[PDB]
Amino acid sequence: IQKAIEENNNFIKMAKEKLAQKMESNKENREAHLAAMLERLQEKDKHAEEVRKNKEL
Amino acid sequence: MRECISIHVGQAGVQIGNACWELYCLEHGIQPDGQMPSDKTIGGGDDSFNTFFSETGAGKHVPRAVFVDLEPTVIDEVRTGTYRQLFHPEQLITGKEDAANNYARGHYTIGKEIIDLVLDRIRKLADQCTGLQGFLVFHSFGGGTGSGFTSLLMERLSVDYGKKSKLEFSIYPAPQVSTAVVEPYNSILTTHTTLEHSDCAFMVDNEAIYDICRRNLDIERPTYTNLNRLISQIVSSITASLRFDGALNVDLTEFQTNLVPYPRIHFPLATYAPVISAEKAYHEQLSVAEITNACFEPANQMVKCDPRHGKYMACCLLYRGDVVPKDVNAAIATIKTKRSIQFVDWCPTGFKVGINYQPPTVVPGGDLAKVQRAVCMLSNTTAIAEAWARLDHKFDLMYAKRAFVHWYVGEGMEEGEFSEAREDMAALEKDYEEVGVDSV
Amino acid sequence: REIVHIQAGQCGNQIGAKFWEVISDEHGIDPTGSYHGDSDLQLERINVYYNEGNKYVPRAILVDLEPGTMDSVRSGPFGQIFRPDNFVFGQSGAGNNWAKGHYTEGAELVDSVLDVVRKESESCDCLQGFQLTHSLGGGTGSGMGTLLISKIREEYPDRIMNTFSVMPSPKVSDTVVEPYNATLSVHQLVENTDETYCIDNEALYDICFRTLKLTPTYGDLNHLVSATMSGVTTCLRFPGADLRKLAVNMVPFPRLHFFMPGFAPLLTVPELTQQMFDSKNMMAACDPRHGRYLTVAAIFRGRMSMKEVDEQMLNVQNKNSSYFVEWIPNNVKTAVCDIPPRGLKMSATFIGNSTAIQELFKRISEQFTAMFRRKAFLHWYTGEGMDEMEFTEAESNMNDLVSEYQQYQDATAD
Ligand SMILES: Nc1nc2c(ncn2[C@@H]2O[C@H](COP(=O)(O)OP(=O)(O)OP(=O)(O)O)[C@@H](O)[C@H]2O)c(=O)[nH]1
Ligand SMILES: CCC[C@@H](NC(=O)[C@]1(C)CSC(/C(C)=N/O)=N1)c1cc(OCC2CC2)cc(=O)o1
Ligand SMILES: Nc1nc2c(ncn2[C@@H]2O[C@H](COP(=O)(O)OP(=O)(O)O)[C@@H](O)[C@H]2O)c(=O)[nH]1
Ligand SMILES: [Ca+2]
Ligand SMILES: [Mg+2]
Ligand SMILES: [Mg+2]
């Protein structure tokens, strides 16, 4: 009976853990993808300010 | 005691939940306002129908159910539908933005915003149970909510309720009425993730339910209302042993013992008969032998496959209505001599029989004729793996070119999850091959 | 589920104006904003494009660096139904110069445009995304249009962005530097839009001249565009899928999101279907039988046997299987709307993500390299602060886009 208890608690434990890793790796990946997008749009603004500065020259 | 909690996820799960609960109410004499005149014990009771219905002091019989969707348009129809007074508002949970047929959005981006609320509402229903038996989860494989959020929920239920039984009713995609080209992706992903958290899953091929409505009910282009009223009959036949009493009544859990030889081999093939229009049922009463013979006609299966080219590991017959054992044993004897029922060599060849004497009911205004007797056959056959092979082949075609995969990666998923899920399905296809080979 | 509409440039505002006239009529809206329709289906999805004294105001934003085109909108039909605060115009103009629209005369005004976007979006219960009407041959629609898309994507990174882009054709050339404005704006659309519907003027001109037999004004070309745009948005505007769900199923690869529209008639379901798939009914100057379809979406309008539509769409696929890639199963989706258009008992609109669209980019690239090979008219751009690399980059990016369409046209299942 204690072996049955142990296996149920270990199944609950592993499930809770595997799910926790999934929801963290996904949070990190999505934040990174969205950071790269906003970073590229920052280089467009940097390139645009350099275009307007090259004109007045 | 022995209560069951139903969870309906996404459009398909919700709209099928509507058909089932409407049908349950008709079977138990429960009015749209929740009143049940025949119920003399007010406020509670341990009747068979109390496994699915709780009772209030005002005499209202409330389903032990939860409807969940990431957008509100489908559940709003339940809020303003014929059975609006049947459900407490807290049993109807809705978000604002759907999953867009994206598993990743249903499991992560959007689903993680409502999962805690859903679990809290499921907990409130479980606290009303004196001896909770398990859950019934209705969902599609193809939708982003049906696939993604269902996988997340099943994972969370395993944590919060241990190995308490969880049964699935899953809508297997049919290209025809499908609006998702990425449906194979969502199907493989959800099957892989839920496989270790589900004890028994009943797949329903929309294409099979579609053909049965065109052929047997003479409906040119069936709608979801047509499909769902037929699906509800199958669900009713399967759950009738939990909601009704009877001497010859065999509990679903007892069938489950025979249907699941290994944890991963838990996908029974369902077959239902009779499906007959009123015009044809008039002056033609189908006997026990006729509806039993129809169970072994592949045209009546819920999933497109050929059991005649596979092997059986179990055969269960769930009769309901005017049926006695004498007729059943006579009909089975005939079929045992006229059909190719080949069993694996490590399982006995007997047919397990159950009989519920409450006759079947039909939704008024529907296309299904009211019959005196009906039967649902639950068989565990290797042939159901054909449904995996068709879906895995479509997966492979698109994934070889990484078609549409950027939508999943953009939400935070990795390609490793795709390959990992596809390999699990490959092992499952192999598992169904291994169980069919003869012993040494 | 609200959509925010934006009109930019001369073309963008005239196409957008026609669009609102068509859908306003379909929803029973009069030029003053009142509802006088006979069907409740006209109001079930009215909030998608309109806000609510028991009136309906388009959720639209009109933009242009010159008041000429926009002033004609206020006076024209349905001109008063628009919200006056949503008119945002300058004075100096763009001079059909992409640089002026994307960097100079456009960057100064872009901020005041965003302010109107924020106000409209904050009144949305659940904003789906945006749609833009503009041309790629001008200066405001192309230069400032692409700029505004990049700026909207910063504040609304998780909202779908669609564009109805009018492509330049020598048969209706208003200028000679159009191959520059198109190649520069295409360089942008490849990065910051989820779906782009290529409205090719060459196709509209050939439809008006050959088919309709008009030996053609911008009003004739736009009568096609208004019918195309009405059919495309049908599933959104009448009951019976949000922008993201649509984009998820139509865009197998992020860069390949440029579609060929089609409309019919320009009558039975077989005839209607065959005409809709004919190269003569394409709103883009591309022959689909010179490439392969990655995805297709079709909408049928009118009282017609749905069982017949299902069989006719399965028939065309089977008999034309060679023009649909085998590695995307079930890549043709179809809908039926019981409400017909105006003046037609039954019509059909279709959008296709076909590899044959490279023909459109091959034409714009040839007109570009023909001028860039000699540095013609480059002072209109370098004078605004550009360099030559930015021109070559846009050329290389659009050339790579053609190579990718060819990669998947050649791909095989085995
Ligand atoms: N049998 C049946 N199938 C349905 C029904 N509704 C949708 N489906 C199927 O479900 C699949 C699409 O998933 P849906 O359930 O509609 O989508 P969802 O679960 O709400 O998830 P998202 O909408 O993407 O957020 C397709 O294969 C449909 O054919 C229904 O009422 N009955
Ligand atoms: C010719 C039909 C075009 C229409 N598509 C449909 O009407 C159906 C049939 C409904 S379902 C569906 C899909 C993709 N299912 O998977 N295609 C459509 C509309 C649309 O709005 C764009 C906004 C700017 C205006 C985007 C799109 O991509 O397709
Ligand atoms: N179909 C159509 N195309 C137009 C219309 N007006 C301009 N165009 C095209 O758009 C290009 C010029 O861009 P335009 O929008 O007029 O310049 P802008 O005022 O700076 O935005 C040319 O190639 C024209 O062929 C119109 O009313 N209908
Ligand atoms: Ca009672
Ligand atoms: Mg949904
Ligand atoms: Mg102009």
Author numbering:
A (entry chain E): 83 to 139
B (entry chain C): 1 to 440
C (entry chain D): 2 to 42, 45 to 55, 58 to 220, 222 to 246, 250 to 275, 286 to 360, 369 to 441
Can I see the authors' text?
Strikingly, microtubules are a major component of the cellular cytoskeleton and a highly attractive target for anticancer drug development due to their implication in cell division (chromosome segregation) and tumor vascularization, among other functions. These filaments grow from αβ-tubulin heterodimers, which are modulated by a wide range of small molecules known as microtubule-targeting agents (MTAs). Of particular interest is the colchicine binding domain (CBD), named after colchicine, an alkaloid extracted from Colchicum autumnale, which has been used as medicine throughout history and has allowed the isolation and characterization of tubulin. This domain sits mainly in β-tubulin, surrounded by the central hinge helices H7–H8, the strands of both tubulin β-sheets (N-terminal and intermediate domains) and, capped by two loops, the catalytic T7 loop of β-tubulin and the T5 loop of the α-tubulin subunit below.
PM534 is a novel synthetic compound derived from the Structure–Activity-Relationship study on the natural molecule PM742, isolated from the sponge of the order Lithistida, family Theonellidae, genus Discodermia (du Bocage 1869). In initial polymerization experiments, we found that the compound inhibits tubulin assembly in a dose-dependent manner so, we sought detailed structural information on the interaction of PM534 with tubulin using the T2R-TTL macromolecular complex, which includes two αβ-tubulin heterodimers in complex with one molecule of the stathmin-like domain of RB3 and one molecule of the tubulin tyrosine ligase. We soaked tubulin crystals with a concentrated solution of the compound and determined the T2R-TTL-PM534 complex structure to a 2.45 Å resolution. Additional derived compounds have been shown to retain the interaction with these centers while making further contacts with α-tubulin T5 loop (αS178) and top of helix H7 (αR221).22 Our structure highlights that PM534 also interacts with the 3 zones of the CBD, making contacts with β-tubulin N-terminal domain (β-strands S5 and S6), helix H7, the intermediate domain (helixes H8 and β-strands S8 and S10,) and α-tubulin T5 loop. PM534 cyclopropyl is deeply buried in the colchicine domain and forms mainly hydrophobic contacts with several residues of β-tubulin, including βN167 and βF169 (S5), βT239, and βL242 (H7) and βL252 (H8). The pyran ring establishes further interactions with βV238 (H7) and, the propyl chain with βI318 (S8) and βT376 (S10). Finally, the oxime moiety makes contacts with βN258 (H8) and α-tubulin T5 loop (αT179). Remarkably, despite a full occupancy of the compound at the site, the T5 loop was very floppy (especially in chain B), which may indicate a high fluctuation in the hydrogen bond established through this region. Otherwise, PM534 also hydrogen bond βY202 (S6) through the ether moiety and βN258 (H8), which further stabilizes the interaction of the compound with β-tubulin N-terminal domain.
